[PDB]
């Protein structure tokens, strides 16, 4: 199970689209 979640886990004004990535990670991981 540790192996599984390791495989899952792989100026800020410019980097708010990265936060979409974060929501998508929470979107993708928990789905």
């Amino acid at each position: 199970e540790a192996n599984d979640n390791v495989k899952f886990l792989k100026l800020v004004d410019l980097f708010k689209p990265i936060m979409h990535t974060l929501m998508l990670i929470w979107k993708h991981s928990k789905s």
Binding site: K7, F8, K10, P17, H20, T21, L24, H28
Partner: peptide
């Protein structure tokens, strides 16, 4: 006085299947 980012991140999550 960002559609392609969505699709590509879906692609990378599917690479980690």
């Amino acid at each position: 006085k960002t559609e392609e980012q969505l699709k590509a991140l879906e692609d990378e999550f599917f690479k980690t299947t």
